[PDB]
Write a protein that binds this ligand. Sequence first.
Ligand SMILES: Cc1[nH]nc2ccccc12
Lengths: 20, 336
Amino acid sequence: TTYADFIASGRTGRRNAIHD
Amino acid sequence: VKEFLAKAKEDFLKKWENPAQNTAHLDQFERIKTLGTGSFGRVMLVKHMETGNHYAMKILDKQKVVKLKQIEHTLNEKRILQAVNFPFLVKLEFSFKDNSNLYMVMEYVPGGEMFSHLRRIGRFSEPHARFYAAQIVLTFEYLHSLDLIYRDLKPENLLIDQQGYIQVTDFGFAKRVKGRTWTLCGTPEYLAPEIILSKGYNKAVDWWALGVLIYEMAAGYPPFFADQPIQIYEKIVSGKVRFPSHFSSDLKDLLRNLLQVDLTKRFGNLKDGVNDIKNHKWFATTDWIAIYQRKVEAPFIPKFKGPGDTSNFDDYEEEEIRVSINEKCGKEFSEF
Ligand SMILES: Cc1[nH]nc2ccccc12
């Protein structure tokens, strides 16, 4: 499931902004 | 609406052209706990000695701001924040600077980040998501009328207050622009295609971001995600979006118009502006006036143990605040 894929991803924590 | 915004703009303009400066000093606050961190600083829960009031103090290391080339963005942030006034925008109470840092003292929002609640709970119901989304819609309507582009919408930047209402924090990428702008900035999952494709863009990017937010709140995960940003960028510009089976047809339709790669067709950017969003079927049960007046009952009210409680926030490693004996980057931040 997409949910399972998300939870297993490295992007479930706080996401940093991108500069430059 | 039009009349309200006109007067709001008069108020904003007076502060925009004559910004408040040096309204407090570090020694007037008692540092209590770190509530969040960032590349060039942190946000701490502090107590104003003279009043006993609690506030959230954002500390920015001037040297780090310069190294990351965020001087203009930081000046934008403070100049804009001290000039705005809306029920869903966190209030900047004081701002000052010393030899080493810049300080922005804002109203403390105890309920914690939407991010925390969304991740823990999994996903919000449509009525729950709709409640928050309505507040963002009104806030963007307010900000855009002032020629302000927000550029950093995400659950991490939205705090829940004691009444269950949202408080937009972090104006680090906010900019007052009448024409188009080109800075590559924001968060991967929330970047509109125009930004990724290195072309001039406008306020429409905020509306795309709203689509990402609503999708994430209702699904529990973003419409475009992967382990590496490049992969996320490929998904965003592809023009493909899949919706969970539980999404109502009205929600899907709103999202397809919000997450529209074609600017001449994206909701919020058409000739009717925000009205195309406000009048959409998904928002049929939304009483915009009541939302603005905070009289609508919130679907979630955070738990509190009293004033200064931080249970709704994660624990961050503490670090001493050292103020150099020498002034750093004085000319760069003279107007702060
Ligand atoms: C927790 C909290 N209250 N107010 C804030 C303003 C910016 C960042 C965090 C905040």
